[PDB]
Design a protein around this nucleic acid. Structure first.
Ligand code: MN
Ligand code: MN
Ligand code: MN
Length: 430
DNA sequence: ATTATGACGCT
DNA sequence: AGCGTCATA
């Protein structure tokens, strides 16, 4: 009754860029704008691997992970932009720098949690309270929410898409109680007003379009964001959760897209998020552990407490390269050459990081994969990182992996290496 | 032969 | 610590 927590204490948004690497390349090259377009890495093997796809290209069935040669079969006029290569490897600096542009704008509105290269969570609870105190109990005009969808509306007693959006927004606004500064639905609405402002600023100041979700926690905000991509934002209210979740595959919820989610489906014999409500918290804990069980019990009711962390910068800086098929490294000179290439890119990024962000990494993690191992990583070893010097770091990395060579001979490396990974970690203020 | 990342959980 | 899981361009 009066004591059941409803998880409506916060206003949380998730802002996610549309087709982000494609937009970065479209800004740079106007010829790519408003075209079926994709971003590819490498080229020699099957035309290269696609890692981002414009919405025009998606209409032809082009997806991420697709080889460009195969994408061209679906979409002959597909335009491509290639990821930069430096020191023999893909280099993602352009996209990291574009990300910083977006993150710095968002940070003007609230403290953000960088969740990927192209998205961040915002806790807007305080900003909403402030905007509410200025407003005076005026109704919120539809004109303040020009790109907002209200999930679940319209409903009850037009054949165009923008028409439907407005109908839902109208129903939503008319149901509001703007007289109550503690009403969660009102708080979400004001959150959505602020996010319109945020998204307008991002587009004005970078040229990049994005989508967003507004809800009471990170999982619902993330889910909401995807509902009306691209270039739109979606409000998912607490009240909208039972209908939304009644047909929502469990795998769609963040963190349930892998083995845990599959086990929820298999063990319980269910399909949709809403079906979880019929289990006790103890039942869920018995199957999925104490933490997962409590999390699922609350999550299927729309409730989650994971805070928006105040962290705008990545906490690791890493350099990685695969050596697939017959390109696997089989000599000492090869292994050392590539460790140096990775280490030189790492030095570059680390030095820039120290100057920009007043911090220094203190641990170097070295990871390799061996031919025959299905696992992402075969071996991970750490050592000290005391100087930002590529030759030292590459010499150190070789030392910690040296004993992995099962070859009797010194000159050969066996079994051949199919991945090298250098990562700088454990930052301290400097 | 999707690749290049990056956060967090477990023991 | 080293490994595993999950995630995103
Ligand atoms: Mn995106
Ligand atoms: Mn994203
Ligand atoms: Mn994506």
């Amino acid at each position: 009754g009066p004591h059941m927590a409803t998880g409506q204490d916060r206003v949380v948004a998730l802002v996610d860029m549309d087709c982000f690497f494609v937009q970065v390349e479209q800004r740079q090259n106007p010829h790519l704008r408003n075209k079926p377009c994709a971003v590819v890495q490498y080229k020699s093997w099957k035309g290269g691997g696609i890692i981002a796809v414009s919405y025009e290209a998606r209409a032809f069935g082009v997806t991420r992970s697709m080889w460009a040669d195969d994408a061209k079969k679906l979409c002959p006029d597909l335009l491509l932009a290639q990821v930069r290569e430096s020191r023999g490897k893909a280099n993602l600096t352009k996209y990291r720098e574009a990300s910083v542009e977006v993150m710095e704008i968002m940070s003007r509105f609230a403290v953000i949690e960088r969740a990927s290269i192209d998205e961040a969570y915002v806790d807007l609870t305080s900003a909403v309270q402030e905007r509410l105190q200025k407003l005076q109990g005026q109704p919120i005009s539809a004109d303040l929410l020009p790109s907002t969808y209200i999930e679940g509306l319209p409903q009850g007693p037009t054949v165009q898409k923008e028409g439907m959006r407005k109908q839902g927004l109208f129903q939503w606004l008319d149901s509001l109680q703007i007289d109550n500064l503690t009403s969660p639905d009102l708080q979400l609405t004001v959150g959505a007003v602020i996010v319109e402002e945020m998204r307008a600023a991002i587009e004005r100041e970078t040229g990049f379009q994005c989508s967003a979700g507004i809800s009471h926690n990170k999982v619902l905000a993330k889910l909401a964001c995807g509902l009306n991509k691209p270039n739109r934002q979606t409000l998912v209210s607490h009240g909208s959760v039972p209908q939304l979740f009644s047909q929502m595959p469990i795998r769609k919820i963040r963190s349930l897209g892998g083995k845990l989610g599959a086990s929820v489906i298999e063990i319980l014999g269910i399909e949709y998020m809403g079906e979880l409500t019929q289990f006790t918290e103890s039942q869920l804990q018995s199957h999925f552990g104490e933490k997962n069980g409590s999390w699922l019990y609350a999550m299927c009711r729309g409730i989650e407490h994971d805070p928006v962390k105040p962290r705008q910068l990545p906490k690791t800086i890493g350099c990685s390269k695969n050596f697939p098929g017959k390109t696997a490294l089989a000599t000492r000179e090869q292994v050392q050459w590539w460790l140096l290439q990775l280490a030189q890119e790492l030095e570059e990024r680390l030095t820039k990081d120290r100057n920009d962000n007043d911090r220094v990494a203190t641990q170097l993690v070295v990871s390799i994969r061996v031919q025959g191992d299905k696992r992402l990583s075969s071996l991970r070893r750490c050592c000290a990182l005391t100087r930002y010097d590529a030759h030292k770091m590459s010499h150190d990395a070789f030392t910690v992996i040296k004993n992995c060579n099962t070859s009797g001979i010194q000159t050969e490396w066996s079994p051949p290496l199919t991945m090298l990974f250098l990562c700088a970690t454990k930052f301290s203020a400097s």
